[PDB]
């Protein structure tokens, strides 16, 4: 069975960084495309970023440079979605999805496998 623990989750304060991991176990194929999504309150699911077995990471989301860096190491079978300079706006669901096809996709129905959700709280800052 393939299962795709997440980890890393919880609250930052506005401008904080956080990094998320999802841990791939008993992937069946030789290939495969990893994305992180995301669900905001209220909103679409949306793709954030995307890295395969033999393309590197991009980011679908736009923001900054900058605030989206997915990797992966490939030996610990693990993808990883690294924040900052986080806003109250990142706040959302993250999730990691998991698909044989190796190009990019930003289209969550691409995807067959997919990690339980991590929540992502961004507190604000005074004002």
């Known amino acids: 069975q393939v299962q795709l623990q997440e980890s890393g989750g919880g609250s930052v304060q506005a401008g904080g960084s956080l990094r998320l991991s999802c841990a791939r176990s008993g992937w069946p194929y030789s290939t495969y495309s990893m994305n992180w999504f995301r669900q905001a309150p209220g909103k679409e699911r949306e793709a954030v970023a995307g890295?395969?077995?033999?393309?590197?990471?991009?980011i679908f989301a736009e923001s900054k440079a900058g605030q989206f860096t997915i990797s992966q190491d490939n030996a610990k079978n693990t993808v990883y979605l690294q924040m900052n300079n986080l806003k109250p706006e990142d706040t959302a669901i993250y999730y990691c999805?998991?698909?044989?096809?190796?190009?990019?996709?930003?289209?969550?129905?691409?995807?067959?496998?997919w990690g339980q959700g991590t929540q992502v709280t961004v507190s604000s800052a005074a004002a």
């Open positions: 999805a998991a698909r044989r096809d190796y190009s990019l996709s930003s289209s969550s129905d691409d995807f067959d496998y």
């Open positions: 890295i395969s077995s033999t393309m590197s990471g991009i």
